[PDB]
Write a protein that holds these residues in place. Structure first.
Motif, PDB file in Angstrom:
ATOM      1  N   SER A  60       0.820  -1.203   0.000  1.00 33.24           N
ATOM      2  CA  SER A  60       0.000   0.000   0.000  1.00 33.24           C
ATOM      3  C   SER A  60       0.856   1.256   0.000  1.00 33.24           C
ATOM      4  O   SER A  60       0.291   2.318  -0.210  1.00 33.24           O
ATOM      5  N   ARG A  61       2.142   1.139   0.201  1.00 35.22           N
ATOM      6  CA  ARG A  61       2.991   2.358   0.104  1.00 35.22           C
ATOM      7  C   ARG A  61       3.060   2.820  -1.334  1.00 35.22           C
ATOM      8  O   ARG A  61       3.034   4.020  -1.611  1.00 35.22           O
ATOM      9  N   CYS A  64      -1.463   0.640  -4.090  1.00 33.65           N
ATOM     10  CA  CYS A  64      -2.903   0.708  -3.873  1.00 33.65           C
ATOM     11  C   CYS A  64      -3.158   1.635  -2.709  1.00 33.65           C
ATOM     12  O   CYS A  64      -2.279   1.879  -1.903  1.00 33.65           O
ATOM     13  N   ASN A  65      -4.413   2.033  -2.594  1.00 29.63           N
ATOM     14  CA  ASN A  65      -4.797   2.947  -1.552  1.00 29.63           C
ATOM     15  C   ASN A  65      -5.614   2.220  -0.500  1.00 29.63           C
ATOM     16  O   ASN A  65      -6.630   1.656  -0.836  1.00 29.63           O
ATOM     17  N   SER A  72       1.342   7.662   0.542  1.00 32.85           N
ATOM     18  CA  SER A  72       1.487   6.548  -0.344  1.00 32.85           C
ATOM     19  C   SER A  72       1.026   6.956  -1.745  1.00 32.85           C
ATOM     20  O   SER A  72       0.260   7.879  -1.962  1.00 32.85           O
ATOM     21  N   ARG A  73       1.599   6.306  -2.741  1.00 31.01           N
ATOM     22  CA  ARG A  73       1.166   6.514  -4.098  1.00 31.01           C
ATOM     23  C   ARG A  73       0.222   5.332  -4.241  1.00 31.01           C
ATOM     24  O   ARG A  73       0.118   4.419  -3.403  1.00 31.01           O
ATOM     25  N   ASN A  74      -0.537   5.437  -5.245  1.00 29.02           N
ATOM     26  CA  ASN A  74      -1.533   4.468  -5.556  1.00 29.02           C
ATOM     27  C   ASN A  74      -1.296   4.245  -7.045  1.00 29.02           C
ATOM     28  O   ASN A  74      -2.165   4.546  -7.830  1.00 29.02           O
TER      29      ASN A  74
HETATM   30 NA    NA Z   1      -0.999   3.920  -1.319  1.00 25.51          NA
END
Ligand code: NA
Length: 129
Positions: A60-61, A64-65, A72-74
């Motif tokens: 999730s970092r 994905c969110n 975090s980037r998604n």
């Molecule tokens: Na994320």
């Protein structure tokens, strides 16, 4: 859902992972076995506060969110919960982005330490594919 080995191999093959960026299907099955024990619902929290989700333990970092991983980037543009579905499409689509990112399958620690350099063909032996 907890996949059987051949059932997941067939699912991954149908979703275009066999030889995706040069990685034979046995690589993908091996990675799934040691990341999640073939359980789509697997989650694991990391020291940094991120969590890994689903059959391929996508983090999730970056990918994905999950609403609780600051900064975090998604990059897969998906809620992390989508990765826990019995339908592995979202996991597979995101995994293709990850493996494309420059470090190949070394992005998956269990692959590097338990699959890489082993006879991964063994993971698809016996399967009707
Ligand atoms: Na994320």
């Amino acid at each position: 859902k907890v996949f059987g080995r051949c059932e997941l191999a067939a699912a991954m093959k149908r979703h275009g992972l066999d030889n995706y960026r040069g990685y034979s299907l046995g690589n993908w099955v091996c990675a799934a076995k040691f990341e999640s024990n073939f359980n789509t619902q697997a989650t694991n929290r990391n020291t940094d506060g991120s969590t890994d989700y689903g059959i391929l333990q996508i983090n999730s970092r970056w990918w994905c969110n999950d609403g609780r991983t600051p900064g975090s980037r998604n990059l897969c543009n998906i809620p992390c919960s989508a990765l826990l579905s019995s339908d592995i499409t979202a996991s597979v689509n995101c995994a293709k982005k990850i493996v494309s990112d420059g470090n190949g399958m070394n992005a998956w620690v269990a692959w590097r330490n338990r699959c890489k350099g082993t006879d991964v063909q063994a993971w698809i032996r016996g399967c009707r594919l």
